[PDB]
Design a protein around this ligand. Structure first.
Ligand code: NA
Ligand code: NA
Length: 99
């Protein structure tokens, strides 16, 4: 009843094509706040980037890449106010960039 959604994290750059993914429930509507929590978890455990490191970064975002070719960029240092939910099975991949 779960699926993997691939993700990548850019902090200072790697020379690798890392095949990492996050576990989500299949075909479930979720919020951008839910995704933000999962992004924060992998930032900490994979890269040692804590919430305080995000507070002290000049810019940070994650981007949801949809299967239809469109994207939504979420600013990790700003509030999330949309009520829109998105379906996990419509998501192709998630990218994260922290400065
Ligand atoms: Na990278
Ligand atoms: Na913003």
């Amino acid at each position: 009843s779960t699926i993997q959604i691939p993700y990548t994290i850019t902090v200072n750059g790697t020379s690798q094509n890392i095949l990492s993914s996050l576990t989500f429930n299949k075909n479930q509507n979720i919020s951008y706040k839910d995704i933000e929590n999962k992004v924060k978890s992998v930032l900490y455990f994979n890269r040692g980037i804590s919430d305080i490191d995000l507070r002290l970064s000049k810019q940070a975002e994650y981007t949801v890449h949809f299967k239809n070719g469109t994207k939504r960029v979420i600013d990790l240092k700003s509030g999330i106010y949309t009520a829109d939910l998105i379906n996990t099975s419509d998501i192709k991949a998630i990218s994260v960039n922290v400065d």
